[PDB]
Design a binder for this molecule. Structure first.
Ligand SMILES: Nc1ncnc2c1ncn2[C@@H]1O[C@H](COP(=O)(O)OP(=O)(O)O)[C@@H](O)[C@H]1O
Ligand SMILES: Nc1ncnc2c1ncn2[C@@H]1O[C@H](COP(=O)(O)OP(=O)(O)O)[C@@H](O)[C@H]1O
Ligand SMILES: Nc1ncnc2c1ncn2[C@@H]1O[C@H](COP(=O)(O)OP(=O)(O)O)[C@@H](O)[C@H]1O
Ligand SMILES: Nc1ncnc2c1ncn2[C@@H]1O[C@H](COP(=O)(O)OP(=O)(O)O)[C@@H](O)[C@H]1O
Ligand SMILES: Nc1ncnc2c1ncn2[C@@H]1O[C@H](COP(=O)(O)OP(=O)(O)O)[C@@H](O)[C@H]1O
Lengths: 400, 408, 331, 408, 325
């Protein structure tokens, strides 16, 4: 008995479709929805080459740079370029400290939800041009380039098919929807659509185990053991395939020496996913110890790290990212307002500039306007503050 | 059904708040529904409310950064009142998560369950009518409806509840037919004057029968549900029954507002729990309140973050600042508080109380209203005067000045 | 099956009410208490609050240098609420116990600060008993050879008290709970105090402190009086000024009359000086040693030379600590 | 026979090393046995091997004291390989004693049991002979020895293993009779030239018969038996089995080399276990490594000691200093690494890589081989050039430079 | 019940007692001991105390720089107390063990210093315990029961009653006593108050040092209650001829033949660094000379070994000087 079926939910990187460099490791300025930052993207491409040719095992990637430069964007691009169905987890370092689960459980969940299984289910699809609508419950005369065979089907399904495009389409899936495209009926009458849907391990654990229940998390070891054995069973028999995904850990310095050991122990395995860390801190103390090392990472692990650096954005790059995000969020904007928003983003932060978009859109919608203007941007800039402004104002208050 | 388990002490101070007070254009009129002044934060609060209405706040949260006594809790209560009729509101401080007898998980558990609410709606054949006659005997009472005046046998407890609601002849009120309970809804339009209209505080004759089929709506929170059952199993069985109710179609889940004051005193594990709870389709709009700047996160050492919030969660947060009240506004807030408390006070006493308020805080001036009233009553007066306020301000001190005096 | 039934040391036996009276007007002589007129007046205002019912959700804090009689003010307010008003006077350091956790200690204090009247027809004799006494009944070296009051006894007692309240022969009187040196409590106990005060049958809370801006125990933030902010804006703060010569003379006279001592006038002046720059309670301690010394030489009165002998025999705190401290510096 | 659980990635970077590269008098040649430079430390290591073989390490230990990337792990592996043909080597960093699931005792015992090797010598029926023909019919195989050609039925798995071993007609190889497996011993001496001798890569016709009784020597590790039982109960059964085997006289338990890098990260708690372990009669030669001087012992708070090691166990430790590498030494090292990795590299590319090595570290330069090789392969070359090395240096950074950039 | 460190490794096998004799008068040559007459005389006074029975409730402490012979003095007093007296030589860091808590470790150390004589076989009480407790590597495989020790104590009482056994109070030595915290010092203080209690020698090389587990500094990191009940014996650092004689007797013990110039260069090396480093160099030099087919160790072999293996001061200073970059 085994039943089956975050970042994309908030949609902060919905425009990232692959790395975009291509041209045999040569970055394109526009590419697939990624602008600027050529060196980091090319290093990421070299990382994909290493992963593809099987020479990455035992190593990991680290991404350094100031916040708001696109570390998670580079990770998402690498994950998408690795494979169209590649799982991608994007946890934060502080997240593993939980009231419910221990650090072991949190890191194990993050690891397992990064490795995926592609379940390949060969559903038997009935395709065929409907020469005649047979009445009814009866059969259905379906023909292709092989033969013409009657297939039993319900009366209500016949009533739905008569509404469907006849005779263009009528490519039904077994006990499922009827896809009307065109006359595709070809080859044999009973084809196999091998739906290859990839899910990571963790959804398999939660589905196998126990709405608002998320308000009222540990997975029992027996479930983990049985799934570990039975996934190997499907791999042996051939139903599914195991795909190494990407596990991203933002602000790696918040981890401690007591979990870096777990990272080293776990990633030293065959079915281990690519490990990406991100940090914006230089030399800093290792949590749980007294010594100071670069990036808050112990020296033993750090010697296995491919370190990439992300440079801060410039005028044109920031304007381009703002344009992409506005297009993705169904927001219309003017040129001078775009310049003002770009200036605001470079002055304080790109994430704050992205945050201001929805507020500006709503303040514009309220006055029955279609194009967000510079006045709307200035209004939402006055309403909501960023980190530096609030800290400065209220620290000036706290001077006593 | 069940009672309410809302800590009214934390809300009683903010009792004059009846919403945010914005016009159609969203501008602040500087005086509406109790709130006075603080236009910028009120406009931002209205924008937040509009975002909540259109479900654009998928996981984003609100943070209010300002000095103590600048209306952060008042703004949160105003948001909670603006989001609907009786959207639940559960204010809390971070310090409560540190309890010697209950785990932090249980505290955050309960304070989350107090925030999201349930509107139960059900059509009942209740005794909705006008009290034409009252004969307490077995309390034979005449209720007039679209049918006519019907004589009903009630209990003395029901008549006592009717007295509690202060009901006179000619009031459109429903008395429960299944159990028996009087809840005042309004008066009757049979005895309506010019200024009393229908579908308002005056209600016309209840259409139908004395057993009128009316859609009763009761506002509850799951915390009252858990305390209704005289453990995780209890919460789970409430979970399933609520799920059954919502699939049935007689229940509606509304997201409330969860106010978190003194955010800097939450452990970094509590922030992770809050982030995990902010990830659900149904969840309260978590509003943080901060008055400490770049602070060390509890649970970690030698790390500094804005407002003591980890950079993981804090990036999903909007920041609204609350400015300090001016003396002219100071007087208006303190006057509103005094008027709502029924404490008559003179103009010069109001001036001096405003000076005291701009000296140290506003909560201090607010608590310095009952002692002044009692000192006035003892002296043999009815209204507080300047001398009384000066005497009561000399007798009692605030924390800052008391610590300063004790330092010397 | 359920049966029924500070002063032992007698350091405040002379305290009988606050003494202000005259419609909240402090009397200089009054009944026991002497001086500190502003503190008396503020205590009377708080007393009016407790009487009417406008103190719920609030508490009292008294800040002042040690030796200014803040515990005396608390005792006076407890007395003036009625002759049978319970009064507990625990210290902050007394909640750290080998057998009772902070939960049990604070709960025991709170339940010991709530009284119930027992009317008993034979004439309905009224007997006022605290809840904790009733709890300890349902359980001669017991003080030496646990004390954990079990939970089921507590719920049974609460249900019994509710039943006896509805029946109409017992009535609950909220007492006064006093916490001396409140800065020694930690955040996990301040939270318990904040949560317990949100009850209908909650005793008046008085906390006393003698230290200013101090780190909250359990945290790393500086707060006034070592009390978290969530409890500090629900506090009525009164401050007691240090005594002067005439007041200390009067208190010394009252205490000597209480403890059966006959002292000469110049001896009273010298003891007032003693209580003037060392501490008043130190002089209070010295009176009994002087009385014991005077009986050794077969005397009826205590002379100044008896004080000069007793002062050399026993040392006050400042001298005793400075001695060892400067020895250690010289070591 | 059980499989092997050696962590091949930690010894993958050290694969060219064959021994210490020491001549007959104990002196060190400049380049031999896949080892370049560090003649002083290599002579010291050879002396230490002499002491170990002479049973003079009756409770002592070694410490390699040198800056990072100076061959400490390489010299430890060289000592392990000089101890014998298949002496176990168990590298470790102290940080792994800090685990969540398994305790410190479990980690340290697991790493100790990875160094106590066992040479099994099992008497088994064997099929050492020349594969004359392979006629598929169960693939009946003819095996030739001194007696003649015997035709026997062969299992498909053994045939697949023979194909993996690449054995053809005219090859004297070994097969298994009781279990069934093929190991390539060599070709028959029917084509024996001056360099093809007997009992070597060329094996003569087996005297006797195809079916023989042979003492098979096989290397195993105790922890390998631990992973072959799926607690301390299984371990106890393993020690009982090992005792039975050794008392039978068919096997010998060999002490190995247990490397501990970053010795300052071990607690004073772990050092007691280490000290009480290496004092045993059957114990691995525990070799530490360190690159920091006077350091605080972890577990205490102010007691600073050499290399973070307590003054008790440090008494019985000999210290060997490992020096830095000159540019030509680094060039030779990187060339050896490239040759062992199958990567062709130019001369000026080696010059630039050596410059990079002397700038930051040696292990970093070693790691910058596969990325450069793949960049060259994508570009369309056969060997790495200077441009590829420069470009892969501008793409990937190292810890010190990345931290320096992140400083501002 | 069934019946039958420093000696096994060595470095103290040549010391057959203090050798002072002549009614408490230190002899320069004596029985292996070389020099340090004052400490030896104080130790002899301690033996006199133990024999007369005036040591109950007290204990001995030995201070001095490392490499001066505190363990030598302890072994000498152990040998002088009798031919088969137990002698345990634990360190202050061996009570922090993963398996045994400090109580179990210190109790094991104490019972390893209470010997029993059976008629002659002398065995440690803890050895008897371990014999009455259920693979060629069992040292890998503590917590040796809680009731078995009580049973063995009762049986030892019986063996004392009927006359089959004799109790021998041994010597328990704790090197680097500042390692112990205030927790273990209380256990030591409580355990000394028994009729069958071993003489307790502590050693330390540290002056004013904070007591572990507390915040107050004390001499030698020992609480005052124990420090006021101690007989402190101070050992002065060696001079050239003493260490030369020490090296000579050690080499005679480990079958090494060496020339005079090699002896003096080894003596100077030991004077600069430690007696223990110079002692360690001897075996390495002997093995180096064997490879070169030499019977007598020359001075150039000392050169080679001193260049090969580093001492602690150089090893630490080299890498402290490393971290300058
Ligand atoms: N090179 C880039 N191309 C396209 N979008 C980018 C690029 N760099 C940053 N962004 C956008 O900026 C937003 C914020 O950047 P993010 O990666 O969250 O910052 P951080 O590096 O601190 O995680 C992301 O939503 C991402 O889409
Ligand atoms: N702008 C405002 N309008 C009306 N009332 C206010 C305003 N600001 C503060 N108050 C009142 O002042 C009292 C103090 O509460 P509050 O300001 O919320 O404390 P804090 O700011 O420390 O959270 C509240 O009862 C609140 O109703
Ligand atoms: N106004 C007063 N009237 C009577 N006694 C007083 C007064 N002020 C102080 N005392 C006496 O001073 C002593 C110390 O008072 P208390 O508050 O119990 O301790 P402290 O003042 O040292 O904190 C008490 O014994 C009390 O009788
Ligand atoms: N003397 C040497 N001879 C051959 N290869 C060496 C030598 N020293 C180092 N190497 C190689 O260079 C790399 C240096 O890393 P390593 O010696 O492990 O550094 P450390 O010992 O400080 O951890 C290793 O992969 C090793 O194979
Ligand atoms: N007086 C002595 N007689 C004989 N040997 C001595 C003497 N003093 C020191 N030694 C030798 O010096 C070596 C180191 O002395 P040791 O007792 O280990 O110093 P520590 O007091 O630091 O333990 C020992 O092997 C010991 O044999």
């Amino acid at each position: 008995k085994v039943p089956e079926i975050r970042i994309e939910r908030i949609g902060a990187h919905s425009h990232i479709r692959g790395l975009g460099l291509d041209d045999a490791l040569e970055p394109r300025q526009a590419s697939q929805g990624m602008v600027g930052q050529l060196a980091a993207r090319r290093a990421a491409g070299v990382v994909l080459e290493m992963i593809r040719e099987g020479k990455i095992a035992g190593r990991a990637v680290l991404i350094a740079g100031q916040p708001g430069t696109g570390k998670t964007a580079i990770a998402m691009g690498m994950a998408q370029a690795l494979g169209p169905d590649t799982p991608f987890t994007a946890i934060a370092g502080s997240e593993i400290f939980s009231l419910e689960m221990s650090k072991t459980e949190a890191l194990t969940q993050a690891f397992r939800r990064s490795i995926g299984v592609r379940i390949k289910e060969e559903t038997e699809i009935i395709e065929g041009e409907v020469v005649e609508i047979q009445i009814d419950v009866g059969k259905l005369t379906l023909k292709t380039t092989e033969m013409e065979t009657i297939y039993d089907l319900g009366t209500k399904m016949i009533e739905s098919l008569t509404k469907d495009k006849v005779q263009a389409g009528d490519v039904i899936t077994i006990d499922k929807a009827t896809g009307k495209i065109s006359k595709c009926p070809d080859g044999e009458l009973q084809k196999r659509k091998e739906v290859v849907h990839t899910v990571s391990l963790h959804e398999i654990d939660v589905i196998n185990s126990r709405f608002l229940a998320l308000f009222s998390g540990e997975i029992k070891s027996e479930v983990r053991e049985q799934i570990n054995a039975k996934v190997a069973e499907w791999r042996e028999e051939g139903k599914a395939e195991i795909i190494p995904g990407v596990l991203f850990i933002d602000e790696v310095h918040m981890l401690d020496i007591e979990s870096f050991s777990f990272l080293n122990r776990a990633l030293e395995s065959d079915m281990a996913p690519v490990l990406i860390m991100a940090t914006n801190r230089g030399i800093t103390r290792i949590r749980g110890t007294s010594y100071q090392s670069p990036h808050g990472i112990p020296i033993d692990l750090l010697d296995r790290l491919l370190i990439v650096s992300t440079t801060p954005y410039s005028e044109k790059d920031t304007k381009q990212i703002l344009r992409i995000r506005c297009e993705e969020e169904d927001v219309e904007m003017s040129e001078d307002a775009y310049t003002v928003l770009t200036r605001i983003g470079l002055e304080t932060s790109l994430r704050y500039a992205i945050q201001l978009i929805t507020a500006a859109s709503l303040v514009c919608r309220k006055r029955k306007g279609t194009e967000v203007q510079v006045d709307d941007i200035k209004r939402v800039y006055s309403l909501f503050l960023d980190e530096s402004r609030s800290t400065q104002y209220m620290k000036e208050y706290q001077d006593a | 059904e069940v009672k309410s388990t809302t800590k009214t002490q934390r809300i009683a101070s903010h009792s004059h708040v009846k919403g945010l007070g914005l016009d159609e254009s969203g501008l602040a009129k500087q005086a509406a529904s109790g709130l006075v002044g603080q236009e910028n934060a009120r406009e931002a609060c209205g924008v937040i409310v509009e975002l909540i209405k259109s479900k654009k706040m998928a996981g984003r949260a609100v943070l209010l950064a300002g000095p103590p006594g600048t209306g952060k809790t008042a703004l949160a209560l105003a948001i909670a009142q603006e989001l609907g009729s009786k959207v639940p509101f559960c204010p809390m401080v971070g310090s409560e998560v540190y309890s010697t007898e209950i785990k932090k998980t249980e505290v955050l558990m309960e304070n989350f369950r107090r925030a999201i609410g349930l509107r139960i709606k059900e059509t009942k054949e209740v005794y909705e009518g006008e009290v034409t006659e009252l004969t307490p005997c077995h309390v034979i009472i005449g209720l007039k409806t679209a049918k006519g005046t019907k004589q009903l046998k009630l209990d003395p407890s029901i008549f006592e509840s009717l007295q509690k609601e202060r009901v006179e002849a000619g009031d459109v009120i429903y008395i429960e037919a299944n159990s028996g309970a009087v809840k005042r809804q309004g008066r009757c339009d049979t005895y309506a004057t010019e200024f009393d209209l229908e579908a308002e505080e005056y209600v016309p004759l209840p259409k139908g029968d004395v057993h009128k089929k009316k859609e009763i709506i009761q506002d509850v929170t799951l915390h009252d549900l858990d305390v209704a059952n005289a453990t995780d199993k209890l919460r789970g069985e409430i979970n399933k029954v609520v799920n059954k109710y919502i699939d049935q179609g007689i229940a509606e889940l509304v997201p409330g507002v969860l106010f978190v004051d003194e955010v800097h005193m939450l452990d970094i594990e509590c922030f992770t729990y809050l982030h995990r709870a902010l990830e659900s389709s149904i969840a309260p709009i978590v509003i943080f309140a901060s008055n400490r700047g770049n602070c060390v996160i509890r649970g970690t050492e030698d790390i500094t973050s804005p407002h003591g919030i980890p950079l993981d969660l804090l990036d999903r947060v909007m920041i609204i600042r609350t400015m300090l009240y001016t003396p002219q506004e100071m007087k208006q807030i303190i006057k509103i508080r005094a008027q709502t408390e029924g404490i008559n006070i003179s103009e010069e006493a109001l001036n001096h109380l405003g000076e005291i308020g701009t000296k140290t805080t506003l909560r201090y001036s607010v608590q310095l209203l009952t002692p002044a009233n009692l000192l006035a009553k003892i002296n043999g007066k009815d209204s507080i005067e300047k001398e009384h306020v000066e005497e009561i301000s000399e007798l009692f001190y605030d924390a800052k000045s008391s610590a300063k005096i004790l330092a010397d």
